[PDB]
Design a binder for this molecule. Sequence first.
Ligand SMILES: O=P(O)(O)OC[C@H]1O[C@@H](O)[C@H](O)[C@@H](O)[C@H]1O
Ligand SMILES: O=P(O)(O)OC[C@H]1O[C@@H](O)[C@H](O)[C@@H](O)[C@H]1O
Lengths: 474, 474
Amino acid sequence: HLKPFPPEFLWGAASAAYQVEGAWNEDGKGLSVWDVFAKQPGRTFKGTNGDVAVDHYHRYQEDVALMAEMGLKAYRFSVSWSRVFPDGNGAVNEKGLDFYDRLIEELRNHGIEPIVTLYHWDVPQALMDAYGAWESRRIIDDFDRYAVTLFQRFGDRVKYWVTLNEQNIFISFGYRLGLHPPGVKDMKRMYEANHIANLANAKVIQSFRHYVPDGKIGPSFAYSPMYPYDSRPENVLAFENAEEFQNHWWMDVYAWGMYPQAAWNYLESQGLEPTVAPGDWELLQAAKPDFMGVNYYQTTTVEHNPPDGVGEGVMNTTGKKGTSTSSGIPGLFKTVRNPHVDTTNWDWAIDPVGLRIGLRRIANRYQLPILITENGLGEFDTLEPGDIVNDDYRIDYLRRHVQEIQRAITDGVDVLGYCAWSFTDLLSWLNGYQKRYGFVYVNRDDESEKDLRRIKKKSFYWYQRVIETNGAEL
Amino acid sequence: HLKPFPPEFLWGAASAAYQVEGAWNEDGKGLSVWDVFAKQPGRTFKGTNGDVAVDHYHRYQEDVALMAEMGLKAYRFSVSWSRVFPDGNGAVNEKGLDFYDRLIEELRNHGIEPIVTLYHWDVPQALMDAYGAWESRRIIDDFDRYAVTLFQRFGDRVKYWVTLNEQNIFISFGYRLGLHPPGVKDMKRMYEANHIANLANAKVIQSFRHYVPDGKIGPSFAYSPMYPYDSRPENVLAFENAEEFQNHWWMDVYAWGMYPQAAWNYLESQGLEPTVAPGDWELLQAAKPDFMGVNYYQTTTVEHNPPDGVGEGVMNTTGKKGTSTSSGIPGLFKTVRNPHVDTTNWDWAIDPVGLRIGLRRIANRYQLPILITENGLGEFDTLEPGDIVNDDYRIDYLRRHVQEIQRAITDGVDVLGYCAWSFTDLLSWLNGYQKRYGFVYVNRDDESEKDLRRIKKKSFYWYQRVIETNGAEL
Ligand SMILES: O=P(O)(O)OC[C@H]1O[C@@H](O)[C@H](O)[C@@H](O)[C@H]1O
Ligand SMILES: O=P(O)(O)OC[C@H]1O[C@@H](O)[C@H](O)[C@@H](O)[C@H]1O
């Protein structure tokens, strides 16, 4: 007795501006931190960058026609802040706004609901140069000016908005792991920037209530639900520590305005806790979102880890399977291979039931509606003769996730929509172009732009049918 | 470096009226449901009952002097509703109150803080005869009237109160498993009674805020933290179901005034959900407790359970190790042996790290102070020539738990106190006299009443030292 999907369930697909747009220095666009970082030697796969990406800035009309052919109910994209404020906080670049205005009109003219991500990792380099971007409280007012600019321009036409895409990733990768800009590896700096980002999220949610009173807004969290390895009490405890440090650290702030205490105490015991100003807690507690945005791709299995144990692990950026290694926080937990699930060529776990679990944990802890803002399978694809791509592996992945979503809905989770990552193939920040997620193949690779032609994959036709039957036929 | 136990930490021990008092028909006392139930053949181990028990009603001066010798900071006990209102709701029986007043006096005179439990499973049989007791909303006003009598009479000498002792257990055993009065096996009646107990709890918490404004009050929940057996997604999901169904079903209502949605929907799907009435929600939501009382003995490991798999299992009431079998809810989860822990002769898991896990979950989800209202080890004891009871097994159990408590406190959990189960040996409801938990041995068994003389066990002195050092020495 499964519930159906709701009559107006937002069947979607997603992109991010740096990964798709190209036109990195056209029509007055300023440099973003990713324009600079990606052109540093050694930072990205084979030196790939988003100078051209898949040229969505020029080809958006074609891409939207293909969305309309698919029957997409919603398209999630991000706004490139450096297109709108070339120097982050100066005068507005109207040509930048005009691009998003053309895109939104194009979507609406085809009956597609826009879902706008304010921030998908691309703070203008000028703010980084001026004051260190996310490490300065100055960014709170600067992010707010940019958000309000969009809210006033587009608020009439866009109802669904995402504030920060994966704060947990951009902050940890940028300031702990050194793998995203600004390339820092300093845990204290990381938790300071994170706190500032929390304040920026809250502040724009408050502004949103004034400028878009009939809208819906939330953050999109990169959620990997944690599992203990087995029922050994020390492994279950490792699991409580992981869930709290990796997940509650962010989601409790978004939902409740408070950091979890056992994590806080652990950080305070090392002088790593953020610097909290008077007024911070009041702001964080007075910015309730309409939904938790959830980016889900995999679960993580953890076990105990002694004080001299595993810290940073190797991440697979090449698509050679079995190249990842364990990571952790010495004393608290380490990741371990889950022997009950398959993995992708990039060593990501395939765990559709984990999505059902993550959705239940969120509903159960926070009582919040959930918009799944990303989910998808990143894999090698082959273009075959006759412009055919048979990505059965992708269909299988998506079908099983969408079935668990329906089970979560039947369990009583309020899921607003589902945005598959990604609509067209695009640039993977650290994995290049060969790690493909699209319904629509783009003809290019790491060595050549080729002709950038769009080619519908088998999954395109699978999803068109899912959407036509409102999820009744998977 | 661990945090120290705080300076005014309540180092306690506990009992319950039916299990300790005897004097079942003296001084005006009415029949309770347990007076009747225990006399029915087959309901108790070797037909044991509490007509005499360990005769605490006559020997309380001796017992309180033994508590003073130990150094106890607090003693948790229950009031026998049937001593105070022999009819449940008639005229108050002053001789009944007088005993509790004498007991409270003796406690205060020796410096010991009393913790009073309002309800420990012994509703007057008159109420059950009159209107089915917990199955009728009339018990809400009757219970409240009894609590208000006690608040008024003792509010100025008793600061800490527990409302219902293990609602989850007396409701479940009495209305689903048929092991406690009223001896019913009917899920529908179970949830209706449970819902009424919920409202009764909230009602008296509200009364308390008028009558004892400077006091602290909470329910005491029987908490077995759940573990998944392993990282199979289906087992983790079975763990989410078990924690929600066994634990959040109660704690969410105590803390937030709401039932969890997935358990609700699943019950609704079967017609098993409780009859809600206008005002119920407003009442449940307007009755925050000061703390969560936790009674803890063991964790439970679960795994996936087919729609046609395990339901009721064998429970060990004889102390013959290895006679318990798995229990489950078909389709949701079933219990399974945790290979990483030892068990007692009654097949209870020994899992002190489980306690820190549980305290951590409660603090993380509800942010409430915790009073550990029971914890202890039930085993066979041997009396030795010389009045020696070498209960090392018990010392080791309690040492480990107390150590995980200090770890939780350090992790940041606010534990107000710890009350070991039990001060003297006493009657176990279903297991008889041979299942002993006391620091003070009581000379009787399931065959012979002998003389009921109190002998200090090795653990008595152990705990004496613990209290002497405020935890510093174990
Ligand atoms: O590109 P990857 O590393 O395979 O990850 C896939 C996706 O990850 C999400 O975490 C990001 O929001 C996306 O921009 C995209 O990168
Ligand atoms: O007596 P047992 O079955 O060994 O249980 C030990 C304890 O269970 C607790 O939860 C009950 O509140 C106590 O009254 C005592 O019965």
